[PDB]
Amino acid sequence: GMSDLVFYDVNGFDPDAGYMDFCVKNAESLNLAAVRIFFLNAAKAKAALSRKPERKANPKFGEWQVEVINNHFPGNRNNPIGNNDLTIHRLSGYLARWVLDQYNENDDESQHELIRTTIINPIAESNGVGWDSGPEIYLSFFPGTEMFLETFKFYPLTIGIHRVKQGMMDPQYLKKALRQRYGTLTADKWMSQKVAAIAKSLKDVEQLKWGGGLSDTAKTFLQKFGIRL
């Protein structure tokens, strides 16, 4: 695959092969502005697709246009999804990984500041979690990141485990993450072999500041005392 650079002759959905295909087709036309717009508008895009009868559609986010399968219109819910096809959910996962790749591309502080100020994760932010928590953990609040459990250091799973433990989520919602691979390991194999790694990941999640900042009224008050925020 993409990590060991081993290639094969041309079965089930493999998110690593899906990500490769996505990158071949889209890497050149992606930019941070477009990806920011995507993440701010993913849910709205699903809503919009839900009243469009066409089996495929071509939403545009900023300057970047992309073809997706429309599984949101009720008449289309059954239609098969191809391994190289894009859905809003798959795109969310692929773009979260693309943002991480951008972050890891170099360690200049300007790169990190650009990414931290441009990409917003509304789900993370709604929970009191910002970029300061770490890039993998921040990005793991995005839908679709469960496709890449090793990449995201088990956080797409352990966020869900934490939520269940806190009574914030029905255990059934864990089913998606629990079906995924971890690198080369199948779910049966990592559930058996990676308990320590997952526990370590969960502790990272438990230590997040689940909650937020000072109010506008408080900030205005504090400015009267020469405190600018």
From Swiss-Prot:
Binding site for RNA: 13-14, 43, 46, 71-72, 77, 90, 120, 122, 125, 163, 173, 175-176, 179-181
Subunit structure: Homotetramer. Binds the viral genomic RNA. Interacts with host PABP1.
Subcellular location, record wording: Virion
Molecular function per GO: RNA binding
GO CC, alphabetical: helical viral capsid; ribonucleoprotein complex; viral nucleocapsid
Record text about domains: The N-terminus and C-terminus are involved in homooligomerization and play an essential role in viral RNA synthesis.
Organism: Bunyavirus La Crosse
Chief place of localization: virion
Pfam families with a match to the protein in the record: Bunya_nucleocap
UniProt GO BP: symbiont-mediated suppression of host gene expression
Family to which the UniProt record says this protein belongs: Belongs to the orthobunyavirus nucleocapsid protein family.
Highest taxon above the source species: Viruses
Name this polypeptide is given: Nucleoprotein
Function text: Encapsidates the genome protecting it from nucleases. The encapsidated genomic RNA is termed the nucleocapsid (NC) and serves as template for transcription and replication. The NC have a helical organization. Seems to participate in the nuclear relocalization of host PABP1, thereby inhibiting host cellular translation.
